[PDB]
Amino acid sequence: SAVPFHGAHQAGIATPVQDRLHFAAFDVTTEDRAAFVALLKEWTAAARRLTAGHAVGEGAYGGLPEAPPDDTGEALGLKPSRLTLTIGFGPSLFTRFGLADLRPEALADLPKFPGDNLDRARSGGDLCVQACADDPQVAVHAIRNLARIGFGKVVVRWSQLGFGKTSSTTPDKQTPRNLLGFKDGTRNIAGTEKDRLDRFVWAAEKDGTPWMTGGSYLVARRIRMHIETWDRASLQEQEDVFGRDKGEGAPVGKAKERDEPFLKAMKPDAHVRLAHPDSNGGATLLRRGYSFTDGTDGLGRLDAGLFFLAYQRDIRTGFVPVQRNLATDALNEYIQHVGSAVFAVPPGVRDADDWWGSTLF
Amino acid sequence: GSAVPFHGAHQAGIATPVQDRLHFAAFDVTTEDRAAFVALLKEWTAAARRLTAGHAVGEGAYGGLPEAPPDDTGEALGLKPSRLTLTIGFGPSLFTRFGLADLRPEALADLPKFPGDNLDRARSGGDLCVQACADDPQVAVHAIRNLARIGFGKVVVRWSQLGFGKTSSTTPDKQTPRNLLGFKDGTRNIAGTEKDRLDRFVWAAEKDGTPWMTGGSYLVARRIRMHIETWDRASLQEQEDVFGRDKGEGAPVGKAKERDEPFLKAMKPDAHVRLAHPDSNGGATLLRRGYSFTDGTDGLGRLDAGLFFLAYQRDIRTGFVPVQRNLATDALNEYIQHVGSAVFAVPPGVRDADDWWGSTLF
Numbered sequence: 001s002a003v004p005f006h007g008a009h010q011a012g013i014a015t016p017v018q019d020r021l022h023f024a025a026f027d028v029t030t031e032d033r034a035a036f037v038a039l040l041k042e043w044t045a046a047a048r049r050l051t052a053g054h055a056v057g058e059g060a061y062g063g064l065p066e067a068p069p070d071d072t073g074e075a076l077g078l079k080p081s082r083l084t085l086t087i088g089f090g091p092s093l094f095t096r097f098g099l100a101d102l103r104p105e106a107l108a109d110l111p112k113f114p115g116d117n118l119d120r121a122r123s124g125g126d127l128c129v130q131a132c133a134d135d136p137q138v139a140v141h142a143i144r145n146l147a148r149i150g151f152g153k154v155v156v157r158w159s160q161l162g163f164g165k166t167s168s169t170t171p172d173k174q175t176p177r178n179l180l181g182f183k184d185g186t187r188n189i190a191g192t193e194k195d196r197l198d199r200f201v202w203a204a205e206k207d208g209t210p211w212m213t214g215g216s217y218l219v220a221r222r223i224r225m226h227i228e229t230w231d232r233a234s235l236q237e238q239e240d241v242f243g244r245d246k247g248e249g250a251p252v253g254k255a256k257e258r259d260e261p262f263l264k265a266m267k268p269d270a271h272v273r274l275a276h277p278d279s280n281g282g283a284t285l286l287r288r289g290y291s292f293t294d295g296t297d298g299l300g301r302l303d304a305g306l307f308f309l310a311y312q313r314d315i316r317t318g319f320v321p322v323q324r325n326l327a328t329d330a331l332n333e334y335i336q337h338v339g340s341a342v343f344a345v346p347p348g349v350r351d352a353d354d355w356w357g358s359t360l361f
Numbered sequence: 362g363s364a365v366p367f368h369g370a371h372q373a374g375i376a377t378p379v380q381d382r383l384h385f386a387a388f389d390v391t392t393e394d395r396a397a398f399v400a401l402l403k404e405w406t407a408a409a410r411r412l413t414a415g416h417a418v419g420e421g422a423y424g425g426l427p428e429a430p431p432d433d434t435g436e437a438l439g440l441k442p443s444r445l446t447l448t449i450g451f452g453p454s455l456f457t458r459f460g461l462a463d464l465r466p467e468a469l470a471d472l473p474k475f476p477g478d479n480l481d482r483a484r485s486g487g488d489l490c491v492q493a494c495a496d497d498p499q500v501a502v503h504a505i506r507n508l509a510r511i512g513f514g515k516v517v518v519r520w521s522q523l524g525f526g527k528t529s530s531t532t533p534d535k536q537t538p539r540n541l542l543g544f545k546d547g548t549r550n551i552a553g554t555e556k557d558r559l560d561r562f563v564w565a566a567e568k569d570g571t572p573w574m575t576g577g578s579y580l581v582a583r584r585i586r587m588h589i590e591t592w593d594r595a596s597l598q599e600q601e602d603v604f605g606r607d608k609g610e611g612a613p614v615g616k617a618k619e620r621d622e623p624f625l626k627a628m629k630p631d632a633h634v635r636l637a638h639p640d641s642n643g644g645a646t647l648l649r650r651g652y653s654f655t656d657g658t659d660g661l662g663r664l665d666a667g668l669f670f671l672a673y674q675r676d677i678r679t680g681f682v683p684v685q686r687n688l689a690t691d692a693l694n695e696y697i698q699h700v701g702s703a704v705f706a707v708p709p710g711v712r713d714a715d716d717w718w719g720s721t722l723f
């Protein structure tokens with residue numbers, strides 16, 4: 001019902017994937033290093049409260065009537081809902097506070113990719129807060145109140161709501177389906193594989209940046225789907241595009257979803273074949289993305305897709321090689337990348353005296 | 362995650378207990394062929410019966426012929442009904458087609474201008490709507506999407522709104538949710554069990570003058586933006602004065618419990634509850650059924666939050682219109698703005714497996 005906030009790593013990466021997401025990117029408006037560390041400390045205290053289901057500060061009510069409530073109150077009466085709050089630092093942040101020489105080399109700028117159609121307003125950002133919970137209102141309440149505490153020092157650059165499974169009605173032992181209708185997440189790094197997380201996800205001290213040990217690197221991509229075009233393709237084109245059948249999610253020529261794939265039975269430009277580590281030098285990713293549907297656009301189409309989030313030990317050896325291998329993916333007919341950002345995700349908050357970003361500052 | 366019965370004298374999704382998620386879509390009809398339109402209404406109803414029971418539309422989501430697109434888009438496979446409801450409504454603009462002019466109900470009143478209005482006409486109006494409510498947003502989206510797909514050619518989506526969480530209650534035995542202003546919303550509503558109050562205030566009656574509408578209702582949708590920056594810097598006393606209830610318990614001012622009856626003369630002359638209360642409006646009562654939304658940022662460094670407000674009533678002219686008029690001096694006005702609007706006549710329920718949506722109009 002709650003997920004511990006403290007640890008060697010930040011929660012919300014290897015911890016169980018919650019039902020809903022509210023992802024927020026912030027831009028820093030202050031030049032004062034001290035004012036910013038002060039904010040980071042205030043945020044951590046508030047995050048401790050929020051992840052345990054308490055209001056921030058003095059609470060949402062019952063204080064001096066002449067004062068605004070410390071907490072906007074829309075979460076009163078709700079449970080922690082497995083809220084986790086993960087903070088990340090964007091490349092642009094390291095142009096401030098004299099941190100230029102402390103940018104990790106592993107936090108590489110993404111190249112341009114064939115087909116990219118990036119909306120500059122929903123891209124990048126100085127920092128991010130990933131808010132995962134089973135209740136969308138708990139997640140939003142977290143983002144809202146963190147933005148309120150930071151007003152005057154950070155502004156909200158862009159924001160994205162997402163949903164995955166609804167765990168009160170869907171079994172834990174069941175792969176969710178994305179909005180194209182295929183099972184999503186079958187071949188992924190699991191939170192249980194400590195060895196795989198150490199190899200592919202967590203920054204090692206010998207990786208070159210000491211203050212990032214225990215951290216990870218995050219790639220965010222807002223990926224629109226062309227729903228109405230996808231929905232007119234035959235059942236067979238859809239299955240050809242991924243290399244798995246729609247119903248069971250089995251690799252072509254196998255019987256069960258979790259049969260290991262035989263890559264040569266797939267079409268050379270099938271998604272799974274091109275994304276598989278065997279096609280990419282062993283490059284392996286922890287995917288933790290969410291579906292989104294924001295409404296309908298100007299021509300009556302559904303503005304929906306996948307808010308793709310990947311964690312990895314080094315952007316140069318994780319996302320970048322695999323995304324590059326998708327240049328000729330058959331899926332590309334049906335999707336379009338319209339938003340992008342990278343963040344260095346610092347190590348965890350070790351105890352009640354620690355704070356977000358303490359190793360960097 | 363059980364199913365809600367599709368068949369009834371009334372459409373589900375009104376007096377029904379309020380489900381967690383909303384996906385509301387308004388459609389414009391692009392066909393002139395009345396017969397084409399009736400066939401669509403029949404096909405939509407057949408799809409709805411599957412969808413509300415948790416079944417794939419048509420022949421299913423896979424295992425049909427390889428060379429043909431699957432009948433169901435597939436993203437709801439293996440999910441429970443999730444209390445899905447599908448509620449349909451006809452906008453006034455529809456009665457200018459298929460020779461329905463004479464049949465437009467008198468209670469399908471057009472709304473006047475209200476002070477403060479700033480209605481975006483692209484996200485307003487519409488020939489008809491489908492209100493999709495469920496506890497799982499993937500289920501709600503799958504129903505809209507698949508309904509939109511079946512209607513390709515004869516209807517298109519004029520605008521849609523998702524609500525990520527409810528701000529209304531038709532079950533006063535369960536906890537009242539809060540809106541994005543932090544207040545409990547829905548304490549003094551109409552409960553799905555109060556048969557008397559639903560007949561008196563929500564269901565259209567035969568004598569009301571439109572026979573095909575008997576058993577149906579009238580729906581007002583108002584998209585309402587909240588100025589949360591302004592609100593979040595107001596004192597707690599300011600906030601509690603705006604409504605007339607306290608923030609924590611949600612009790613009428615001066616009283617101790619959420620559900621104690623308000624004593625209106627103890628509230629400010631411009632408190633929201635005082636002005637909205639039926640005693641202040643000649644007994645007018647609404648069924649509120651709204652949902653919160655947030656659509657990203659406003660591009661000015663802030664979250665964009667609001668409330669998608671839905672009211673069902675027996676006659677718009679005796680329901681929303683007088684209560685909205687009385688809010689002209691509401692203290693809440695300083696913190697909100699109405700930015701979208703639409704009215705719909707909601708037909709009666711689908712009686713059985715042989716009936717269909719709008720059969721009493723067509």
Ligand code: HEM
Nearest residue numbers: 178182183184185186187223272275276277306322323335
């Ligand atoms: C709308 C966009 C996308 C959709 C719908 C999608 C969908 C899928 C599906 C259905 C699978 C098979 C089941 C699974 O193992 O999860 C899969 C596998 C995978 N995808 Fe994607 N994907 C998308 C974008 C991407 C991107 C941008 C990347 C990397 C840059 C990526 C990397 C992978 C990887 C590594 C696998 C596991 C392959 C394996 O080892 O079997 N996907 N994806």
Ligand code: HEM
Nearest residue numbers: 540544545546547548549585604637638639668684685697
């Ligand atoms: C964002 C806009 C609005 C907010 C935040 C809001 C909030 C509230 C709150 C906190 C209450 C007290 C608790 C309750 O009994 O539900 C309430 C009651 C009520 N509101 Fe609003 N409301 C809004 C818009 C409207 C509109 C547009 C109408 C009608 C046009 C309306 C009509 C009513 C009514 C009839 C009641 C019940 C009053 C009673 O009988 O005690 N509200 N609302």
